[PDB]
Amino acid sequence: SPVMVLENIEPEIVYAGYDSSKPDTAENLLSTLNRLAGKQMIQVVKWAKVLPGFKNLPLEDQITLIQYSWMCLLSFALSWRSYKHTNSQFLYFAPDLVFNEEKMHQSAMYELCQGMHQISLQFVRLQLTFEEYTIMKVLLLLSTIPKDGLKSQAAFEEMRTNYIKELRKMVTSWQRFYQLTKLLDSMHDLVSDLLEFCFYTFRESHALKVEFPAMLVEIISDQLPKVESGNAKPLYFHR
Numbered sequence: 001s002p003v004m005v006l007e008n009i010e011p012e013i014v015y016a017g018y019d020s021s022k023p024d025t026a027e028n029l030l031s032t033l034n035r036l037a038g039k040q041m042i043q044v045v046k047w048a049k050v051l052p053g054f055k056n057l058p059l060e061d062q063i064t065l066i067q068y069s070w071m072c073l074l075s076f077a078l079s080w081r082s083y084k085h086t087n088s089q090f091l092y093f094a095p096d097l098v099f100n101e102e103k104m105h106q107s108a109m110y111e112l113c114q115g116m117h118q119i120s121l122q123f124v125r126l127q128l129t130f131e132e133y134t135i136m137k138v139l140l141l142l143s144t145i146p147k148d149g150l151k152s153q154a155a156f157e158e159m160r161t162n163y164i165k166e167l168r169k170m171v172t173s174w175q176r177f178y179q180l181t182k183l184l185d186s187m188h189d190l191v192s193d194l195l196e197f198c199f200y201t202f203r204e205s206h207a208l209k210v211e212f213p214a215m216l217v218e219i220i221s222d223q224l225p226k227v228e229s230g231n232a233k234p235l236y237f238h239r
């Protein structure tokens with residue numbers, strides 16, 4: 001049943017809010033992009049809190065998972081918007097913020113922009129259906145746990161596996177499932193890339209003149225303060 005509920009809960013529109021006009025170099029794209037991230041998060045939490053099964057684990061587990069997987073979320077989402085609106089032609093961050101080989105170019109991010117684009121590209125080729133995306137997206141929320149587990153760990157695995165079963169239910173064949181689960185797996189590869197960059201732009205804020213809101217502040221100072229190592233255990237799907 002969930003799928004139905006997911007269409008409903010599937011977050012809406014979010015504006016980045018960039019007073020575009022004068023030269024927009026690194027110090028410009030990133031502070032607005034971060035700002036953008038800060039607003040979508042308020043949206044992701046609103047989304048997750050009604051999710052089937054997930055809304056059932058105590059508030060502690062819920063927030064942890066959102067933290068260890070926030071980057072996957074937003075990035076996976078960027079791909080879908082880029083794919084739904086521009087046919088993947090571009091990276092649709094926000095209605096008021098679209099990227100062309102020029103924005104990616106002078107965003108000081110061209111390389112990661114290309115990676116997130118390579119994802120949207122896989123969406124087109126596979127011609128992803130909302131159903132698939134919505135379920136895959138829950139799988140990303142449920143894809144990176146604390147190396148040592150969760151309080152409601154047992155309840156957690158049954159849940160995720162159920163969503164697995166659901167995605168395969170949706171896939172109804174085994175090749176499709178496979179392509180989709182392999183896509184999500186690869187995501188773990190991109191996200192680690194996006195995170196190390198986000199982290200060093202964090203640690204080197206003022207000096208690079210790249211600001212972060214406050215919402216994203218309390219999250220990164222929490223996410224990478226010690227996990228820049230390997231206490232963040234992603235849960236792949238294949239080998």
Ligand SMILES: C[C@]12CC[C@H]3[C@@H](CCC4=CC(=O)CC[C@@]43C)[C@@H]1CC[C@@H]2C(=O)CO
Nearest residue numbers: 030033034037074075078093194197198201
């Ligand atoms: C965190 C980040 C700015 C904000 C974006 C993130 C990439 C994924 C993403 C996709 C979206 O659809 C909205 C903003 C955002 C969440 C970037 C990767 C590096 C960059 C920085 O490191 C900024 O200094």
